[PDB]
């Protein structure tokens, strides 16, 4: 039952220890054409594909409350990187998938969430981080968290040079407990894919 296969563009991702997909704050995009862009917007289907990233090394020394973030979008080299630098205004939702493979004899729990409009959390607010679109990663049950969120912001189109709405966040809810037959460290990798990449207002070249 727990065999999932996510396909974006011409790339795929299969997982045999999945727990489900978590839709955060909506199931789809709002109206993409608006009165501000004056209908001079287009869609770039070539950008909607995965790109990998490295979050952190989940060791045994990190206690409750270790918070590791990734402000999206990040420094991208593919077609998305050129889109950020070539068109003035962009908008896109995210489809994020985080994997932390140990083996079934470890223990511990990761809270993987997506936070809009990141702001540094005080040691007390971290107890309510579960208000956001989130899942859990527990080597007892699963090894893959899969969240998907639309584009939400005060402006219909944004300038990702100045304002980065979403932030992927991973917190260690229960520290890793290892045995003689469990992994001694875990490496948490991320796999993110933009969806509905709309662009508007092309810029002059630097060549």
């Amino acid at each position: 039952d727990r065999t999932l296969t996510t396909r974006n563009g011409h790339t795929t991702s299969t997982t045999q220890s999945s727990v489900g997909v978590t839709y955060g704050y909506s199931t789809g995009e709002d109206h993409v054409s608006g009165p501000n862009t004056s209908g001079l917007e287009t869609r770039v289907t070539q950008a909607e594909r995965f790109f990998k990233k490295h979050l952190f090394n989940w060791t045994t020394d990190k206690p409750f409350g270790h918070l590791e973030k990734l402000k999206l979008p990040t420094d991208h080299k593919g077609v998305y990187g050129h889109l950020v630098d070539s068109f003035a205004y962009m908008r896109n939702g995210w489809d994020v998938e985080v994997s932390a493979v140990g083996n079934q004899f470890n223990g511990g729990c990761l809270l993987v969430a997506m936070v809009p409009e990141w702001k540094k959390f005080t040691p007390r607010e971290k107890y309510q981080l579960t208000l956001f679109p989130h899942q859990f990663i527990s080597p007892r049950t699963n090894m893959t968290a899969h969240i998907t969120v639309p584009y939400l912001g005060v402006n219909r189109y944004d300038q990702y040079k100045k304002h980065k709405p979403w932030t992927l966040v991973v917190m260690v809810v229960s520290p890793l407990t290892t045995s003689s037959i469990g992994a001694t460290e875990i490496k948490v990798y991320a796999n993110i894919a933009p969806t509905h990449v709309h662009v508007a207002g092309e810029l002059p070249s630097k060549e």
Binding site: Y25, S26, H31, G34, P35
Partner: protein, 45 residues
């Protein structure tokens, strides 16, 4: 109409009392209303 307790209509029109919305969805109610309930598995009452 939250926290308004006048029976008579407002004396000023809807255009002057407040702004007017334009067009071109309550999520958390949909989330909390579809919450799983009951039991799971078998039952021996």
């Amino acid at each position: 109409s939250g926290n308004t307790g006048s029976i008579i209509n407002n004396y000023y029109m809807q255009q002057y009392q407040n702004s007017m919305d334009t067009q071109l969805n309550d999520w958390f109610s949909k989330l909390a209303s579809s919450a799983f309930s009951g039991l799971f598995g078998a039952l021996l009452a």
